Structures are given as C-alpha cells and as structure tokens.
C-alpha cells in the first residue's frame, strides 16, 4: 500500500488516482481493431496490474459522479442497479430453476 513508483510529482504534479502514471499508451478506443491482438497482448495481466486498473477506473467514475460539488443521487442509484444486475446473473441458476412459462 503506497503510491505507485511510476508516479513523478515533479512533472505530473499532485497525485490523482484516476490518471494512469505510467508510459502514455494509446487507449483501446482509437485502436482500429487491426492492432487489437497486439494491444491485448501488450497490456500485462498481473493481479497487480488489473487491481491498479480497477482502482484507476473506479476513481475515474468517482471523478465523474461523486467528486464534483453538486453530486446527486445518480451514482448511488447506478451502483444499486449495477450490483442488482451483477448479482442476478450470479443467482441465475436458482432463478431459472423456477421460471414462469413451461414452453416460452
């Protein structure tokens, strides 16, 4: 538990957990799908790397829906539906065992 070693306060400035502090990689949005295999293989799949990628995404979502001053109830409704959707797919085996239509 520490600040990432790629972070430099002299060039970047103060730390911001929603900004990637490594080498500036081209994001997947502008990949023309001919470099998709190269882009996926280049990005490592360490447990450390994906955990940092989750936190950098989570703080991006905090920066868009909570950290602004006038943060409404919309993030806290999005989380509830997001968790309900995710947990319905987990409990799909118990839910689909009952169903309503015999043929459908």
């Amino acid at each position: 538990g520490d600040y990432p070693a790629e972070y430099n306060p002299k060039v970047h400035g103060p730390y911001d957990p929603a900004r990637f502090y490594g080498k500036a990689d081209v994001p997947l949005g502008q990949v023309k799908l001919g470099e998709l295999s190269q882009w996926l293989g280049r990005r490592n799949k360490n447990p450390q790397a994906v955990a940092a990628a989750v936190s950098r995404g989570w703080w991006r979502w905090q920066h868009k829906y909570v950290l602004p001053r006038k943060g409404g109830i919309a993030p806290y409704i999005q989380l509830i539906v997001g968790c309900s959707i995710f947990f319905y797919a987990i409990n799909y085996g118990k839910m689909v065992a009952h169903r309503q239509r015999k043929y459908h």
């Binding site: 997947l28 949005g29 502008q30 023309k32 799908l33 001919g34 309503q100 459908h104």
Partner: protein, 76 residues
C-alpha cells in the same frame, strides 16, 4: 411526452420501398467489404458502436416475435 411522439414520427417511419436497389447496393458494398475488409481498419469504439447498431436491429426480430405470438408477456 408530445415531443417523444413527435420524434417517433420523424425517425420511426417504415423505410422507403423504392430503396430496394439502394439498400442492396449498400449490402453489396458490405459484401464487397466482407471478403476484403472495412472491419479490420475501423476503430474499436466505432466497431462497438456498429455491433450495437446490429444489436438494435436484431432486437426488432424478437419484438416481431412477441407480436407474432400475440401478447408480449411470454406465450399466453
């Protein structure tokens, strides 16, 4: 919700029946792309947009499936 009804009139009309050459030529252009390309050079963000467009189109098949069986709440 009158503006929702107004937008529904604008961009939920059935397509022009005279467009049959104009949609197959686009289809033939896509077939010309299909064995050659125009998908390995399209950005993943735009490619994801294109797939969801097909998903939006393919959902009408299941909407029509609910219409063809009568009530949309399962098989009555």
């Amino acid at each position: 919700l009158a503006t929702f009804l107004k937008y529904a009139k604008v961009e939920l009309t059935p397509p022009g029946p005279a467009d049959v050459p104009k949609i197959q030529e686009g289809i033939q252009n896509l077939i010309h792309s299909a064995k050659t390309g125009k998908w390995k050079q399209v950005s993943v963000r735009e490619a994801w947009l294109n797939t969801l467009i097909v998903t939006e189109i393919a959902m009408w098949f299941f909407v029509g499936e609910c219409i063809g069986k009568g009530s949309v709440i399962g098989y009555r």
